[PDB]
Each structure stands twice: as C-alpha cells, then as structure tokens.
C-alpha cells in the first residue's frame, strides 16, 4: 500500500445525527475502497479565510491512511460526491521537514 | 430620503476619469458623482481637480441624504485618485477606514494590445 493524508471539510451547521451519518459514510468509503486508518485528528470547527459555499467557516477532519495505488483517486471521487463535504484534499505522506531547526 | 448616516464610499479611478459612489453598509448605492457629472467634458475629466470636485459633490449629496460616518474603498490607480480621497476627507464627512481594493487578476485574460 502507500501512506496518505486525507483532509475533509464540511458544512458547520450540521447537527449530531447528520455529522454522524457523514462520518460513518466516510469510514464506509475508506473501507470500501481499500484504505485503512493509521490514526485520526479532527480539529473540527474553524474560521476560514475566504468563504467556502457562502459559509464563513468550516468543519475539518484529518485522516491519515494507508492504501492501494490506483484506488486513491477514485476513493477521493467518492468522498467528493458528498453534498456536505465542501472540500477534500489528499496527499501522499511526507517526512516532517524541520527547517531552521 | 432614506436617512442613512453611515456607509461605504467607493472611489474608482482610471487615467481617463474618476467616479465616486456613496453607498450603504450592505452595498447598495445612495448617490453618485463623476467627472462629467460636473460639466467637465474631455480629457479634462481625468484630472485631480475634477476628482476633488466630484468627491465633494457626491459627499455633499449624501450629506444631505443624512450621511455622517464614511469608510472608503479605492479601486483603480490613477490621476488624482488621491485628490479625491484627499478631498472627501475634508468634506465634513468622517473618513473611517481607507482601503485599497484595486482588483487584479491571477493572470487570466489576454489584454488589449495597448496593454503589453
């Protein structure tokens, strides 16, 4: 497999049953596409710089994964099809460049 | 006739003209002035004088509309783009924030051959 990072950014006006269902469906997508969880950090609510979807802020999840090769893109197409996910980004992991150290 | 008393003041300057727009804090206009609003005709429109004259004029108008507190937004970099702000500061309105908004592309559009 390979070492990836996923960022998800959603609409902050979600109640609890909603945000639950979203998260669940993301999990079921990672499973379904081959990707596995190394860890999770969800910082959640924060105030952006430019409005994304007319919204002044957003709800961020960060999921660090390991997975197959070809599948990555199609996986993120499945993530993006969501209506409450206003943004998704993926990256291959990088080693923590420490500068000025 | 609205009785507004606080709002946005836009300056706009090309090297060909100047236009001021007084407006309300969610963006709708109140009055406006320009180079030719005052009778100035030709190239004479892109002077700093008429810049002044217009600022003062639109300021005057809105000041009779009831305007007091006015926060400025300058789009365009031009001839007496300054003299317009420099005027409507001394208008009697109170200039609160002067902001420079001159909008610039991230390189999208092939410009008229004059322009490169």
């Amino acid at each position: 497999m390979r070492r990836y990072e996923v960022n998800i950014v959603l609409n902050p006006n979600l109640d609890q049953s909603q945000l639950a269902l979203e998260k669940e469906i993301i999990q079921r997508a990672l499973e379904n596409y081959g990707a596995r969880v190394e860890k999770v950090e969800e910082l959640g609510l924060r105030r952006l710089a430019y409005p994304i979807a007319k919204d002044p802020q957003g709800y961020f999840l960060w999921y660090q994964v390991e997975m197959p090769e070809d599948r990555v893109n199609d996986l993120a197409r499945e993530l993006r099809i969501r209506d409450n996910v206003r943004r998704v980004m993926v990256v291959k992991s990088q080693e923590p460049f420490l500068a000025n150290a | 006739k609205r009785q507004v008393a606080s709002g946005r003041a836009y300056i706009h300057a090309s090297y060909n003209n100047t236009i001021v727009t007084i407006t309300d804090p969610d963006g709708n206009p109140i009055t406006w002035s320009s180079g030719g609003v005052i009778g100035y005709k030709g190239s004479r429109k892109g002077t700093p004088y008429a810049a002044q004259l217009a600022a003062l004029d639109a300021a005057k108008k809105a000041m009779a509309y009831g305007m007091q507190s006015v926060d400025v937004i300058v789009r365009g970099t031009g001839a007496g783009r300054e003299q317009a702000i420099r005027a409507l500061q001394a208008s009697g309105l109170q200039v609160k924030s002067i902001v420079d908004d001159t909008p610039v592309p991230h390189n999208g559009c092939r410009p008229k051959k004059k322009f490169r």
Binding site: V9, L48, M89, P96, F97, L98, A99, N100 | -
Partner: protein, 70 residues
C-alpha cells in the same frame, strides 16, 4: 525590519494543516513574502511556497486580502 525565521520556533515547513506559523510569512495582502524578507533558503522557500498554496486550497490561509491605510 527583521526577517521572519529570525524570530520564530524551529518548525515543520512541510505542514499545511497548521496555520499559526504559516501565516507569519504572508503580507497584509495574501502575498507570499519574497526571500529577502522571509529569511529562508531556496529549498526552504521553494517548500514554504508549496505548503502555503496547499493550505490556501483548504481555506485556512487567504488567497488575497485588502490593503489598509493609503
């Protein structure tokens, strides 16, 4: 008129997710600072660049802002 990495923690350059540090390299308008005023090196700066643009895509950092005074 001090540089940036002159007063600053010794920190991960290649992290987009963290704003608190990344912002300190942008002007009042969103403009990424030039070398002279950033202080860092060419591989550094080249990396600072990519990190910033990545975060700009996450809406955490700005693409451009407005200039006050004037």
């Amino acid at each position: 008129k001090a540089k940036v990495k002159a007063t600053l923690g010794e920190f991960d350059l290649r992290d987009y997710r963290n704003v608190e540090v990344l912002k300190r390299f942008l002007s009042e308008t969103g403009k990424i600072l030039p070398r002279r005023r950033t202080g860092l090196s060419a591989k550094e700066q080249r990396i600072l660049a990519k990190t910033i643009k990545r975060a700009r895509i996450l809406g955490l950092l700005p693409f451009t802002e407005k200039l006050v005074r004037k």
